[PDB]
Scaffold this active site. Sequence first.
Site, mmCIF file in Angstrom:
data_model
loop_
_atom_site.group_PDB
_atom_site.id
_atom_site.type_symbol
_atom_site.label_atom_id
_atom_site.label_comp_id
_atom_site.label_asym_id
_atom_site.label_seq_id
_atom_site.Cartn_x
_atom_site.Cartn_y
_atom_site.Cartn_z
ATOM 1 N N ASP A 112 -5.393 2.797 5.064
ATOM 2 C CA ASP A 112 -5.232 1.333 5.097
ATOM 3 C C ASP A 112 -5.918 0.804 6.355
ATOM 4 O OD1 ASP A 112 -3.453 -1.175 5.778
ATOM 5 O OD2 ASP A 112 -3.249 -0.896 3.623
ATOM 6 N N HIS B 197 -1.030 3.303 -3.658
ATOM 7 C CA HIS B 197 -1.648 3.059 -2.354
ATOM 8 C C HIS B 197 -1.110 4.001 -1.281
ATOM 9 C CE1 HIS B 197 -3.304 0.833 1.045
ATOM 10 N NE2 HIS B 197 -2.085 0.711 1.537
#
Lengths: 294, 300
Positions: free
Chosen positions: A105, A273
């Site tokens: 991220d 994710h």
Amino acid sequence: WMPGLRQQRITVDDGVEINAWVGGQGPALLLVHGHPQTSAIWHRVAPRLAQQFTVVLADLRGYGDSSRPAGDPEHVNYSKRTMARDLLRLMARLGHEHFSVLAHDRGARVAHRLAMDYPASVQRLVLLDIAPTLAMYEQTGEAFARAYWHWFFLIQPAPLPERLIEADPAAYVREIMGRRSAGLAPFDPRALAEYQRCLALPGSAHGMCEDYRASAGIDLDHDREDRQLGRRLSMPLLVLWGEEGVVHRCFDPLREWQLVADDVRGRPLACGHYIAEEAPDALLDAALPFLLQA
Amino acid sequence: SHMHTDPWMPGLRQQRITVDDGVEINAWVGGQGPALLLVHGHPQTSAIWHRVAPRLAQQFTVVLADLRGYGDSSRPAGDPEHVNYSKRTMARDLLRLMARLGHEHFSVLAHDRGARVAHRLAMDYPASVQRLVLLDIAPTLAMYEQTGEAFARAYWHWFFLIQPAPLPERLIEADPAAYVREIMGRRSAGLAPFDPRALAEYQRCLALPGSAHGMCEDYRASAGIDLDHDREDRQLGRRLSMPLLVLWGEEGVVHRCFDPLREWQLVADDVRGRPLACGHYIAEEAPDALLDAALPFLLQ
């Protein structure tokens, strides 16, 4: 919890300290989290990694227990160049002039810039559930803007997004993380508590929003300059993203990385994710061979 | 332009009209001549028309309506499918409003959310709508379909206000006055172009309990059920049949991110339009230009 690791603070800028969990033995491995989380994200894979690497799990500036510096009109203080310099200096002061990087991220984006600004320091690169920021903004469509709404909310001028975050930070963490494909199921209670505790520290909201603002401005200038001059990542790169996530649906991650890196390999994983917490064993299966050949 | 001395809604009287079960519409009604419905948008109220209503009331019977969830109208609860604030429901609200005031046929001047309501109204009840003037919008469906980096950056709320409750509501209710000021003022002149009374009205009304959820339900419908209805119209070849005038601000996002006249020509058979030298808030930034362009059209 983090067996064998001890938390450490290293001053990386004038009035800027980076909090990190250091442990293990072997070649240096910098682990970098993203939003809205902290180094805690690595608690499932860090013990295994520490058996063959000297692991350094760093809290980005604005996150975790690191400093929360002020913003600035052009967002230099939270630019990927500056945060990457934070991490470079961190590894230097801990005695590691050359290191590998495993990042997720926001951290992965920082790592990207790190590897462009100091290629001699980064041996190998593993980036989790990201495509390059510049391509991701350029290729924005309805689906991406609907799902990654924060990429367009958090960049708005202060104090708006800060008002949202600080009105209820725990609710913010829960809604950002639990509204994705896997929900709140993959998050250990201790880890969730850490994310919420650290997000509530004063100055956190502004720092996170400044990171995003830079990534919608000055950071894209730096990335565009690299693109125009033909400057690309030279060291080996592994890219892993979740088949169930937004990045998979809205972009071609491996293609986008091949455009900005010369030695790239990657594939999707059977998760969303939050790779390191949803699928730690798959992450290790895919990444340990790569990081160990370094 | 705007002065503290300018009159406020001269000749008009405020009225509350029940248009749905537990839903009343507040409206300023006045004037003389054929009927004209004026419909505001976000984050504002009927007050937006205070610059042009005195003139219009000279030739039309004007009805300045507060949308449900806005102004002093009711703020009914939402629902999982967002039917209660769908454009179909709000358009039926306004149809019934005009009916109860004695107007079965009327013209429409609308802006922002109101203009979208007007689009749906003119599709669902074409025999009631004589002429249509829509301010600074392109059709919602094309605007979402054609989202790019620039649009998502500028119309960020189109992707924030639609997120599931209670998130955007949390933002709005943490500081409603700041929400209005930041939504409306982010430009070179700030909030100066808005008469003080008008800004005070928008802030008072947005702060009423239940407002945040109603506004977010409007947006949620426009990212869901409303788009189902609009796509159905497009698939069946149903288009606006009555005359349509579209005016948008040269300095606004719609101009920069879409081709408004083309987009309206795709969903309407009798369309003319052009940009005006102003931003989004046409009726307050450029009332004289608005009237110059629209009175000929509305009077034919």
